[PDB]
Amino acid sequence: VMMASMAIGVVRQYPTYSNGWANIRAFAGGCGLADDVLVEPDSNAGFLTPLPGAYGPLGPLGGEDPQGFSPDGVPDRIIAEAIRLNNPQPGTDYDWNRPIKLDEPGINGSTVPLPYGLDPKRVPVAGTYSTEAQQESRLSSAWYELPARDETERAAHPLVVITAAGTITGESVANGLTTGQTVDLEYATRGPDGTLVPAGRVTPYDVGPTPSWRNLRYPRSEIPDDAVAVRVVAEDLSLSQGDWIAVTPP
Amino acid sequence: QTTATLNWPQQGRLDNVTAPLISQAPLELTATVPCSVVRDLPPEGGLVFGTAPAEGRDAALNAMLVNVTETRVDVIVRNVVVASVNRDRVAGPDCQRIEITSNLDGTYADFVGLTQISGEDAGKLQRTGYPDPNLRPAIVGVFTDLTGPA
Amino acid sequence: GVGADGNVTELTAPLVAGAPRALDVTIPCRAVAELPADGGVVFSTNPAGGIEAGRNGMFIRANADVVYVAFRDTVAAVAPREAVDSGACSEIHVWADVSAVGADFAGIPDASGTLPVDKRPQVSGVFTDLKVPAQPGLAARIDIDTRF
Amino acid sequence: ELGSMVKATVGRYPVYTVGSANIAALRSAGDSCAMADAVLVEADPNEGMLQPVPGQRFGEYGPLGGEDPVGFTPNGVSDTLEPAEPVAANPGTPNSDGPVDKPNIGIGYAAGTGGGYGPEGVNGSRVFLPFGLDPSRTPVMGSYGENKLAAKATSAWYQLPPRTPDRPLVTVAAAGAIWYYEEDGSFNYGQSLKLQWGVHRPDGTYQALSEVQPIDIFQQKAWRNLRFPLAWAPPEANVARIVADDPNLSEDQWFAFTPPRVPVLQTAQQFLGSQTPVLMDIATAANFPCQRPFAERLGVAELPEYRIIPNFKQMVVSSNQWQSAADGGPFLFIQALLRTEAIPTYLRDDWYRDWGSIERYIRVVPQEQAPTAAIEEGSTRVFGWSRGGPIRALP
Ligand SMILES: [Ca+2]
Ligand SMILES: [Ca+2]
């Protein structure tokens, strides 16, 4: 049982990091996890262009008729990949002790502090949380361009990520398909007349904590090679006060 | 055994210094600050010196700070106010030094040249402190707010 | 009970087992126009001041633009208020039995819902908010689960 | 194991013990409530409030900071008074539904000890006063937010009623971080709050006899009741004041207080007799063998009027967990129909003892409208294998 348990993982995760493939790569001048982990130096590059049109006060992130979404619809102490408590903790980050507001409204009109060093003057927000009256919320963003049609690039950019908070539902490894309100990704195609038809949907890869600011992953292998644009479809159908969502452009 | 000693201002320049100790506390700390540097800080004053940045996390709870406000000269060691004095009295032409000794006997700040004016004594020297051996500050460097020639 | 002068009075019935085995409601429609231009909570089943009132009750509401019938916490059978209170539909049947949970509006084309049977409401009384004396179509019927 | 029970009863007598309760039940041939006779309850904790000696001058706020309040402020109290450390119940406790794979941890308050805001006061405080303390008569002074001053305060002398064996207490409500000495001599760190006696001379001025540190029952930050027995005061004292120092600059080293008071201390059997419905928890149900628990008849329950609770550590780890609303306990229809209060209560001669408490239940919707319902009983003839359906038991 032990031998098969440790021999199945080597075959399943390949060519990514396994405990017996790294010991073989170590002979040819290889590191451990330092070769299979990818880091974003500047987490501000790679934002897609929304196709022109006419939108409302939420910008292009909220589409034609956003039902129950507001720019400053986030609670007070929401931090990146953590859950801020009352009394401090040993290994906290810098953003545990910071002003609740920003004192300057962003490109969207919100005053929520953004994670990962996202400039508030470039990255809009939209949230469902409210303290006066609950509602069913919907949102369908504009069509966001996809970069190009080349495999040399997709060899190096295999992801579409969305920074989000709330009670999202998605696919995890430690706990598969924890339910909750939905944030998905629709991809469009072209036509002989010239247009963008909605055909498809991708479900995220949640790894982070429940109410924190985290990254939703969409591998570009699910999205076919004929996809032309991408948009966010978010929906919160719970009238409880502790059931909310919040998104950002892809 | 090989010893080690940290002094500051290194080369006649009042630049900050970093030296994080692994044991989080020295054996002895002796600081002598003249009373002629209080009259050089701006009215709002700041940090004459310290063993942690004034805006670091729990810098006052863990380290030793020598602050100069518009109304006070204060020596805080681990959230324990030691030898607080009014500002213009030190600014007066009678102060000579300030000696902030801290060792296994206790933390004691002296204001040589000054005598007490209130507080049940009004007749002794400004020597103030506590005989606690657990009041030794946590050293990370020496961080001041002055500049120029030392 | 004749109420204070001629109206209907609320009730209190703290069921021990939580949810009943039958929760027929049958509320009329034109007797909703009395709400003060922003309807309150017509016929909740828990008081509006409880700890988690909406998280366990039934909670028909009016919202001044859309009348809806909630459940444990989810929404069934939204309907526009100006269409309802004008007298289009007749009854607001909220049958919530075992093996059936719905919120039919009885006259509006697509204002009918259905929930899973584990969305049964917790009953601790009958708490209306109207001042209507007595209609032939205003009813309620709760069956207590006494099997032991 | 026999001497530890014979000595506990022989000593400590005529105070409270299970041995004393059983002996009284034997001598009275049955009609004697065990613990409802050794417990003194204070209903209306607003008539025993103390009054400052007329002919004194005060600071800016009122008769709670004497002349020079420094660093102490009426709105000087926190809002989240949760404890600096939880209870961390021990594993193996019988009536607790805690997972055995991790330590069971919870927090709790009595009624509003730890609440938020309320109407204004005679000092301008937006503080919620627990125990039913009227805000129009009860000033407050606190020291929250003074992390750079290390400042003190002193109050004005408060008069005292004549000595009576039925009012052997002076009580204060602090909700802070106070230093105190336990009965075995131990100590909890906290901060300094004391109280002075004194003899107000008729043809003269005050005396300032002696200082006294408080005795309490639990280490916490929420509101409480510090006690000073009148057996500590000389037979000639007539006035009392308050002294606060607070020399620590840490963030969570502060406290507040309130004017002192002398209770009236009616017993616990005259207060709630043998007809009033009462919710007795699992631990306190055997010590009150004369109270009537609320009745369930046809699937509907009648509503209780008071709730008897065990001690704090027992409460927050067994009573609030076993009788949860998500587990089917009696809280299902209590959390939705009734709001809680608190009554200050004491054992008869053990002022150091953290016995439980008593709460008052106030209806969310009054009983003039929304009365009780009729049940309209009937009967059927079901078989032995029917099982019409399951019970909704999955919260
Ligand atoms: Ca919601
Ligand atoms: Ca303090």
Side-chain angles (χ1 to χ4, degrees):
Chain A
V1 159
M2 296 185 218
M3 292 291 302
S5 178
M6 285 312 294
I8 282 173
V10 175
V11 184
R12 268 168 61 170
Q13 7 221 285
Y14 173 109
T16 175
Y17 178 86
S18 50
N19 214 1
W21 179 227
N23 293 8
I24 293 302
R25 277 202 262 108
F27 285 100
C31 312
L33 262 165
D35 282 356
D36 295 292
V37 176
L38 307 163
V39 62
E40 296 181 358
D42 173 69
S43 66
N44 277 317
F47 274 96
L48 306 173
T49 299
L51 301 197
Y55 316 105
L58 261 179
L61 171 59
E64 280 92 319
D65 310 324
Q67 192 50 58
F69 278 80
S70 69
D72 46 2
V74 192
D76 297 0
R77 303 300 206 172
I78 303 288
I79 50 184
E81 305 178 19
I83 298 173
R84 192 202 187 283
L85 296 173
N86 281 315
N87 54 3
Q89 305 286 69
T92 71
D93 292 329
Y94 173 47
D95 52 75
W96 268 58
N97 321 295
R98 263 178 78 177
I100 300 188
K101 313 280 189 185
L102 288 179
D103 291 331
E104 295 103 351
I107 197 66
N108 194 27
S110 67
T111 58
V112 295
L114 278 180
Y116 298 109
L118 290 157
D119 285 343
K121 290 304 158 56
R122 290 163 160 185
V123 196
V125 200
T128 309
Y129 179 82
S130 163
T131 311
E132 66 273 13
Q134 309 309 316
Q135 198 178 9
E136 286 185 314
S137 283
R138 280 92 179 256
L139 180 142
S140 294
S141 296
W143 291 113
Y144 284 105
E145 183 189 1
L146 272 177
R149 297 273 311 280
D150 203 336
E151 307 303 320
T152 300
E153 153 194 0
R154 200 181 318 204
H157 300 285
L159 266 173
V160 165
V161 67
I162 292 181
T163 320
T167 188
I168 312 300
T169 185
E171 200 184 27
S172 177
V173 161
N175 36 45
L177 273 302
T178 61
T179 61
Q181 313 313 310
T182 63
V183 175
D184 281 350
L185 200 84
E186 273 214 353
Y187 51 87
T189 80
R190 279 176 291 168
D193 62 79
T195 188
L196 265 54
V197 302
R201 185 166 284 100
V202 190
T203 77
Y205 272 114
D206 289 331
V207 69
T210 316
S212 64
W213 278 110
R214 48 189 181 272
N215 280 326
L216 323 184
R217 289 87 178 256
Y218 307 107
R220 218 199 295 186
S221 61
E222 322 274 0
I223 323 176
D225 188 29
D226 200 281
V228 187
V230 158
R231 70 180 180 181
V232 187
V233 287
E235 188 175 2
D236 162 88
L237 300 182
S238 189
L239 295 185
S240 164
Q241 200 185 9
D243 291 332
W244 58 278
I245 58 191
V247 293
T248 201
Chain B
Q1 160 196 307
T2 182
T3 56
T5 303
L6 158 74
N7 306 17
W8 175 75
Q10 320 282 18
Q11 303 294 342
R13 34 181 168 88
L14 291 176
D15 298 334
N16 299 328
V17 160
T18 190
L21 308 193
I22 184 73
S23 53
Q24 287 188 15
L27 290 175
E28 305 159 48
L29 191 151
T30 80
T32 82
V33 180
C35 295
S36 68
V37 305
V38 162
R39 68 187 77 260
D40 284 26
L41 281 166
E44 308 93 324
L47 259 187
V48 180
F49 79 91
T51 79
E55 58 274 6
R57 186 187 150 190
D58 291 352
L61 164 66
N62 286 284
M64 161 205 279
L65 306 163
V66 184
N67 299 95
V68 169
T69 322
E70 298 89 1
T71 60
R72 272 172 288 139
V73 175
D74 293 331
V75 179
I76 311 280
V77 176
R78 303 193 166 263
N79 275 337
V80 166
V81 51
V82 177
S84 178
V85 162
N86 286 319
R87 161 82 166 277
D88 49 48
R89 192 144 57 105
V90 175
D94 58 16
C95 228
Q96 294 187 271
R97 290 170 270 120
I98 297 171
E99 291 176 348
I100 320 178
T101 304
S102 179
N103 46 10
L104 292 171
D105 293 331
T107 319
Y108 280 102
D110 297 333
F111 278 86
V112 190
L114 265 71
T115 60
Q116 306 216 16
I117 61 170
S118 280
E120 176 274 350
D121 191 299
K124 289 311 170 52
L125 296 176
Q126 202 60 53
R127 173 159 199 273
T128 302
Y130 295 89
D132 207 13
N134 289 324
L135 272 194
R136 309 213 289 288
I139 306 289
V140 163
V142 189
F143 308 95
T144 185
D145 271 20
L146 322 171
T147 188
Chain C
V2 71
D5 46 355
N7 287 358
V8 292
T9 191
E10 324 196 7
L11 284 185
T12 303
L15 301 202
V16 174
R21 69 178 68 186
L23 188 46
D24 167 83
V25 171
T26 304
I27 286 183
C29 172
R30 203 161 287 102
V32 173
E34 289 95 7
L35 289 175
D38 185 74
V41 176
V42 55
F43 202 103
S44 178
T45 192
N46 282 348
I51 299 299
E52 41 166 51
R55 208 180 169 274
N56 298 316
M58 200 195 66
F59 279 93
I60 314 180
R61 277 192 166 93
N63 205 6
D65 58 356
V66 283
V67 173
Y68 64 95
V69 174
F71 282 100
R72 278 264 163 187
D73 217 347
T74 77
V75 172
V78 174
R81 162 152 197 195
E82 66 269 356
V84 167
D85 80 326
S86 301
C89 62
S90 65
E91 307 286 323
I92 316 186
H93 214 80
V94 192
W95 81 92
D97 298 331
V98 63
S99 73
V101 170
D104 165 58
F105 257 82
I108 294 171
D110 203 309
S112 297
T114 307
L115 277 300
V117 311
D118 51 69
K119 287 287 182 186
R120 268 177 282 172
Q122 187 247 334
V123 169
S124 67
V126 165
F127 304 106
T128 180
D129 209 4
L130 311 168
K131 314 298 182 187
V132 294
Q135 273 76 238
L138 178 45
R141 197 185 193 280
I142 311 159
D143 283 27
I144 312 174
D145 195 357
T146 79
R147 78 177 66 195
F148 306 99
Chain D
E1 64 199 12
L2 265 179
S4 66
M5 284 298 173
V6 173
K7 149 187 184 306
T9 293
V10 171
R12 172 135 192 130
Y13 180 97
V15 161
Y16 184 71
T17 59
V18 295
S20 279
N22 299 344
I23 288 171
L26 279 185
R27 282 172 49 219
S28 315
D31 53 350
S32 294
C33 206
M35 205 168 191
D37 279 299
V39 162
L40 303 171
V41 311
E42 182 182 11
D44 188 1
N46 286 327
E47 50 169 328
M49 209 77 179
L50 293 177
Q51 187 268 330
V53 195
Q56 277 184 324
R57 294 297 89 194
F58 307 103
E60 183 67 28
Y61 317 110
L64 193 47
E67 306 288 31
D68 292 331
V70 188
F72 266 89
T73 297
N75 290 84
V77 68
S78 170
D79 274 338
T80 63
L81 296 180
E82 60 92 22
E85 69 275 15
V87 286
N90 310 96
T93 303
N95 284 337
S96 70
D97 59 311
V100 290
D101 294 331
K102 64 180 71 65
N104 191 358
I105 292 171
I107 63 176
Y109 319 102
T113 78
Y117 299 75
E120 298 279 305
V122 297
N123 296 21
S125 276
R126 303 213 58 227
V127 184
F128 183 56
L129 289 186
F131 305 137
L133 283 168
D134 202 300
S136 54
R137 302 153 148 171
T138 301
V140 169
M141 285 276 287
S143 160
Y144 180 71
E146 265 77 356
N147 311 326
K148 60 95 177 178
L149 207 53
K152 58 95 186 174
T154 291
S155 177
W157 305 92
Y158 281 94
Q159 67 101 33
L160 259 60
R163 296 292 186 271
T164 309
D166 301 67
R167 310 179 69 158
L169 270 168
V170 160
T171 306
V172 184
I178 301 169
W179 169 272
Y180 68 86
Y181 270 113
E182 308 194 21
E183 213 195 10
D184 50 2
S186 293
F187 56 95
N188 295 30
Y189 176 52
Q191 290 294 323
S192 179
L193 168 63
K194 296 178 172 183
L195 175 136
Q196 278 214 6
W197 315 101
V199 180
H200 167 42
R201 282 323 183 291
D203 304 326
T205 42
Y206 308 81
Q207 186 70 43
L209 281 183
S210 178
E211 300 211 28
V212 170
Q213 293 216 296
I215 61 188
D216 44 5
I217 57 178
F218 203 56
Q219 174 183 351
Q220 50 162 14
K221 291 185 179 302
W223 295 85
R224 44 176 162 271
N225 267 328
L226 315 177
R227 313 191 189 83
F228 310 99
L230 279 192
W232 279 353
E236 76 278 12
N238 265 322
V239 293
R241 78 158 161 214
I242 303 171
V243 176
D245 199 8
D246 193 0
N248 201 298
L249 291 190
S250 183
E251 183 67 26
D252 55 308
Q253 300 283 155
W254 62 276
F255 59 88
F257 49 91
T258 190
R261 62 171 207 281
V262 289
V264 186
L265 291 202
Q266 173 196 33
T267 194
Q269 171 86 3
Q270 300 157 29
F271 182 44
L272 50 92
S274 65
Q275 293 296 144
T276 300
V278 169
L279 171 58
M280 289 168 296
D281 294 26
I282 317 158
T284 61
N287 304 314
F288 295 78
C290 275
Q291 267 68 61
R292 213 182 58 78
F294 70 93
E296 305 170 353
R297 188 170 170 265
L298 269 166
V300 300
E302 84 168 322
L303 283 181
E305 304 186 20
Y306 306 99
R307 184 196 169 197
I308 305 178
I309 319 168
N311 61 79
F312 196 95
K313 183 174 171 55
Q314 187 77 47
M315 170 184 70
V316 307
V317 317
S318 66
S319 301
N320 284 10
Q321 284 188 1
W322 201 251
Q323 318 163 17
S324 283
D327 295 339
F331 286 170
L332 279 172
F333 48 89
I334 279 174
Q335 72 172 357
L337 281 178
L338 305 164
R339 292 180 280 98
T340 61
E341 202 182 9
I343 303 186
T345 46
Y346 313 100
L347 284 173
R348 197 198 283 269
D349 264 326
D350 196 11
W351 315 122
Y352 283 74
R353 193 56 75 170
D354 179 25
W355 155 77
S357 171
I358 295 189
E359 297 190 0
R360 199 185 255 114
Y361 275 138
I362 300 168
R363 292 165 96 88
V364 174
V365 185
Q367 211 195 1
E368 288 82 4
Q369 76 263 26
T372 52
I375 308 301
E376 194 170 352
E377 183 217 330
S379 67
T380 53
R381 199 152 179 275
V382 309
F383 267 93
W385 59 74
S386 284
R387 197 186 180 276
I391 277 181
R392 172 58 161 80
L394 50 89

